[PDB]
Amino acid sequence: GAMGSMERASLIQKAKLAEQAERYEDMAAFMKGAVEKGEELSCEERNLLSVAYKNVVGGQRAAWRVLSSIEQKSNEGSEEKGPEVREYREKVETELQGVCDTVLGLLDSHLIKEAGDAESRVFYLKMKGDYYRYLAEVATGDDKKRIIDSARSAYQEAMDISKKEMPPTNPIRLGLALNFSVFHYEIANSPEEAISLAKTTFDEAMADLHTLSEDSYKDSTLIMQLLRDNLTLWT
Amino acid sequence: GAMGSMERASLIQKAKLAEQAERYEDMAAFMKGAVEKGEELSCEERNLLSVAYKNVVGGQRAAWRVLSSIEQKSNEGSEEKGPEVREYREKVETELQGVCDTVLGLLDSHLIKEAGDAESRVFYLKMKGDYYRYLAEVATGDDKKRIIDSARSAYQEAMDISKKEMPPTNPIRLGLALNFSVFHYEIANSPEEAISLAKTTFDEAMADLHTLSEDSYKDSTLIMQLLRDNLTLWT
Amino acid sequence: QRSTSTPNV
Amino acid sequence: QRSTSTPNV
Ligand SMILES: *CC(=O)N1CC2(C1)CN(S(=O)(=O)c1ccc(I)cc1)CCO2
Ligand SMILES: *CC(=O)N1CC2(C1)CN(S(=O)(=O)c1ccc(I)cc1)CCO2
Ligand SMILES: [Cl-]
Ligand SMILES: [Cl-]
Ligand SMILES: [Mg+2]
Ligand SMILES: [Mg+2]
Ligand SMILES: [Mg+2]
Ligand SMILES: [Mg+2]
Ligand SMILES: [Mg+2]
Ligand SMILES: [Mg+2]
Numbered sequence A, B: 001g002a003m004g005s006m007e008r009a010s011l012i013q014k015a016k017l018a019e020q021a022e023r024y025e026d027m028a029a030f031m032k033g034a035v036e037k038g039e040e041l042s043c044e045e046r047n048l049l050s051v052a053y054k055n056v057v058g059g060q061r062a063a064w065r066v067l068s069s070i071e072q073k074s075n076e077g078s079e080e081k082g083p084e085v086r087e088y089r090e091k092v093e094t095e096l097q098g099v100c101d102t103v104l105g106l107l108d109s110h111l112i113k114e115a116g117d118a119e120s121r122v123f124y125l126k127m128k129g130d131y132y133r134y135l136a137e138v139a140t141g142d143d144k145k146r147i148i149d150s151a152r153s154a155y156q157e158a159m160d161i162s163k164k165e166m167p168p169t170n171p172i173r174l175g176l177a178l179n180f181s182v183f184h185y186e187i188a189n190s191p192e193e194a195i196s197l198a199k200t201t202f203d204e205a206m207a208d209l210h211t212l213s214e215d216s217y218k219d220s221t222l223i224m225q226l227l228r229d230n231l232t233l234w235t
Numbered sequence C, D: 001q002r003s004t005s006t007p008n009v
Helices: A008-020 A024-035 A043-074 A084-114 A118-138 A144-165 A171-187 A191-206 A214-234 B008-020 B024-035 B043-074 B084-114 B118-138 B144-165 B171-187 B191-206 B214-234
Strands: none
Touching (some): A008 A024, A008 A043, A008 B043, A008 B084, A024 A043, A024 A084, A043 A084, B024 B043, B118 B144, B144 B171, B171 B214, B191 B214
């Protein structure tokens, strides 16, 4: 596309600049361009891809939630205000779905199939789960069940690899488990599964902290605290 | 343009929704559409227009400053990193200039010429000054002097009307004086003019506070505090 | 209150 | 530090 004429390294450089400038739409476009060069991504480059799209979709999700809340209130004693709330919620929703589809497209063409190391494959499968989960957040139709199942299937594949190939303190493994637990609680109507996963993940990570350097310890304990925060919220 | 098919009232409604959702690009597009209906804008609608574009250009200005700083540092012992910093700063700059040109275009076609009340005319002329000032912030070429003069001329016309037609505590008058003082200090290399304007504005507003209701007092004193904040910074 | 998912780092 | 201009309200 539009980034076809720019060097891979220049796209990566500009993604980093865009991050510094809090220009996340630009950052995402640069990283899409980099992915479309066809080479595999390093860990740092996967981080750039992740940060860019998370920030873009994060803003869309926040906006969608505001508009959905206004829409719900409109449908309670409420005075008729016409189609505008629904239309605008739909506009934001369509854009959000578009971003999710873009990310899923990159993963399918061809990041996942070329990812053979545990860190890359688990990261990409987690990402696939996450973006299906974001699609599930706004789904209501004939397809909501299939979207949920797609998220589940991606997370489960990631989980299976992570358990076999990574230590329990690995940040990617931990972040995957965190997000899959959120899936269970928020999407799949499975709070007990969520709690069980968060508890087991936390406990197995705790038991492996002794193997870590000071820096790795910092990384693992940060995510462990998020598991604990959710457990506190959920129980 | 793209908003041509939407009712004016629906554009206004959606601008308000976009504001709630912190979707300022959408908000600006809705308000551009509303302006292009050709009717004059009320005070509330002028506020929507203002908020939308201020937030959009504000993000661009912040990004531009980050990138300009990186660029300046690159040009000091600095290792050569190629054209990317300049290119990306230029990209953001061009987009910023585009937004400014869009706002100035709305003002010229035909908001200012139809504005005959002091509140509307002063507001629009202030806006014209502001967006020329933002153009001046990034100008370096043959045209920087003319851009500065364009800002100056708009602010001066606004000032002349505001002094004749509005009380010294009027928030539009106060905000205009605040921004023109910033112009003097930051753009026109006239710190003494800036300080003088801020001082005189503050003092004349102080003397008129007694005429105000509690609510109007709140509005005026907020802006007066900003004058004071700048005076503290500048002296 | 919403559950926390993995943040940016 | 940069001068403060009129904020959104
Ligand atoms: C090395 C690699 O492939 N990385 C991708 C990552 C570093 C980690 N992901 S993540 O979503 O797995 C994640 C783990 C821990 C934390 I705290 C946040 C996110 C994000 C992108 O960078
Ligand atoms: C009534 C009217 O025309 N309005 C435009 C405004 C209300 C005021 N402007 S402003 O830039 O003049 C301003 C004044 C005080 C403050 I505190 C902030 C901004 C902004 C848009 O709404
Ligand atoms: Cl819409
Ligand atoms: Cl660029
Ligand atoms: Mg090449
Ligand atoms: Mg009623
Ligand atoms: Mg829909
Ligand atoms: Mg009509
Ligand atoms: Mg060197
Ligand atoms: Mg330029």
